[PDB]
Hints:
heterodimer, A: elongated, B: 16 helices, binds zinc ion, transferase
Amino acid sequence: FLSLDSPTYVLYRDRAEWADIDPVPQNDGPSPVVQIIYSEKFRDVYDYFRAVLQRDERSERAFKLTRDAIELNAANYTVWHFRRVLLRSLQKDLQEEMNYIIAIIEEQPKNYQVWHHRRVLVEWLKDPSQELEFIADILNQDAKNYHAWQHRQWVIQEFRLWDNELQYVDQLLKEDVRNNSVWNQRHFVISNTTGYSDRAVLEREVQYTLEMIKLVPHNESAWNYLKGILQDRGLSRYPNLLNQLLDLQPSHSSPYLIAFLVDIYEDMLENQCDNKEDILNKALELCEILAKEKDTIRKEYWRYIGRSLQSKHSRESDIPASV
Amino acid sequence: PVWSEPLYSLRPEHARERLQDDSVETVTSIEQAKVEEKIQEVFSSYKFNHLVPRLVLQREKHFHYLKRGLRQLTDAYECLDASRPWLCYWILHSLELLDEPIPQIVATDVCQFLELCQSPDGGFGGGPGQYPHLAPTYAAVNALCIIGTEEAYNVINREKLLQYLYSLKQPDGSFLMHVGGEVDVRSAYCAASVASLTNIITPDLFEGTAEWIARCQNWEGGIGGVPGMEAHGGYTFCGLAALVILKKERSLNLKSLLQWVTSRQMRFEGGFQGRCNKLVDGCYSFWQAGLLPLLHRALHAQGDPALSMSHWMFHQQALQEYILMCCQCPAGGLLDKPGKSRDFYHTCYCLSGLSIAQHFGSGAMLHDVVMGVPENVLQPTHPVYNIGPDKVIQATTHFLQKPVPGF
Ligand SMILES: Cn1cnc(S(=O)(=O)N(CCN(Cc2cncn2C)c2ccc(C#N)cc2)Cc2ccccc2)c1
Ligand SMILES: CC(C)=CCC/C(C)=C/CC/C(C)=C/COP(=O)(O)OP(=O)(O)O
Ligand SMILES: [Zn+2]
């Protein structure tokens, strides 16, 4: 009816149809702290909201009032709760409410309350037929919106809508191969479909990643993904990996590639490999290069690693103190 | 030497830390480059102005900003009308870090206000007459503990608090944030925080909680809001901190976690980002860097012999430089990044992170690093609760005088 931003908007204390209700002022005490100097509009709407909440008045006019209270502060979870009471109590059409919530999310996409409200609606209606497309629109304006991706995972999982998501992931990786949210979604989809034990799948995934690394050697997301999908079984389980990375040293180097090498050596030393000692020194050499030159921001981390490797892999590590 | 620049961000080698975009441009690299350009100007301003740099924490300015806020806020804070206990917490903790005493009239007035925020059925709301919610509940408890008087302690209705927690507990180990609300790792932390401080932890309250949190650690090493989500500094702090409280840190892969967080520090800016391939932000000086004192304590409990005895496993110098040079508003208060406006949230957590970076401690070992003038040194903070370590001990002891509700 009367929009909050309308030029003809009128305070509630000046509305005839509200003449029967006494507004309820906020009880901040005799000497307030962190007291907010509300505007006229704000204080007026919430004085009247407190009245209807207090009376538990479940009416059409109360329903409309919650829209204005939400507009003034969409983070007010108490107002949201009352609104959901009114939705059920008044038997309100839920698709109309879907239309409403999608508009609010469009304009305030980084708010917890609005996404949770959409979820409850979808739960009530048991209808996910609009979700993937709506979320896609939000992601088109901010491809990393945390609430958006969370809602997408919930919808896909609860309603088993897996069949097209990998295609969607590939599309977004094209637009921005640096989008960590998308690399996460890729892992999410594969984990819950084929899994990573299927050698054909794992093989495919590594080729693609190495590809991308070749195209953009300094993109950390690709590096983390490659590490993430190989580290559970153990890096040393893949003997060809080492040489192939070393072969990128010349024209594809990065502190990322160096760090990976250290991870390979670390695992190798853990699974009792050949040349115990030769491998150790190679690693300490790299740990030093990183801490002193190539990645000094993490000097404290790299010194710790080098110190750990020494503590447990030196030829003297198992040698008794008496020897 | 005379030619040696004592500031890490200003050294000539530092220029090599700029972004390399491999001549492939995307939205991510473009936005990252914008930030680095803005930060570079801040660093270079002394050289172009022909002045010797001086890093001063504007104590007096920040104090005035807080002192006023504790009483009154402009309508700019209407969007926080449902988080007023948070405002109490952020401001009190800031004053505490700055070592400013809390007048007893202020303390009593804070207590009375929080009483009005407390629900008849347990927990605190965002304001008087608002339903209870775990986030403002966490904030309220922390504020009363900072005050630490008998009056403050008595405000909390312990029986109801426990009842409230129970009504939120899920069969799978998680907690709702509030009745008819959503679930994520923050709620576990909020619950564990207030429950431990007030001594209301029953044998079954946190059944399955450590396991549910462990399901939130992902392929990146860090922790997401719910199982399957991208790893984030905010959720990671909440997860590890909750586990520490429950004495279950070992349920996590601490090694992959350590590698993840240390990688979150920006090589050029010196501050922390919240997730891979996004932007630096002052508040992560606590959420992210605060993880390192937690890991240190955990790894040490496992007898890790390789642990340094004087420094956390991040660049303490560079973080202090970022905060002092880039995160202060001249008129008082701190902020996200240059070009952003001040607020009490970033004031709280920038200072919290600064303290972490100044103070190292592990049992008997103690070592400080204070960049800029020595007056910059702040009071220390507890890495789990983010209040004064003394206030934590004081509170826990006091409530141990009471029996867990129901005996
Ligand atoms: C985007 N984001 C980054 N951290 C978070 S959060 O911890 O969950 N948080 C962030 C809300 N948030 C946004 C924010 C924080 N750092 C950067 N941003 C944009 C925010 C909240 C309060 C103030 C004040 N004063 C200023 C900013 C939530 C929140 C809201 C109210 C009370 C407590 C937490 C959100
Ligand atoms: C106890 C408690 C309430 C703790 C707070 C934990 C915390 C900091 C959570 C942040 C969650 C979030 C929505 C991040 C993304 O925001 P963004 O995408 O705008 O920021 P980003 O780009 O830096 O990730
Ligand atoms: Zn921030």
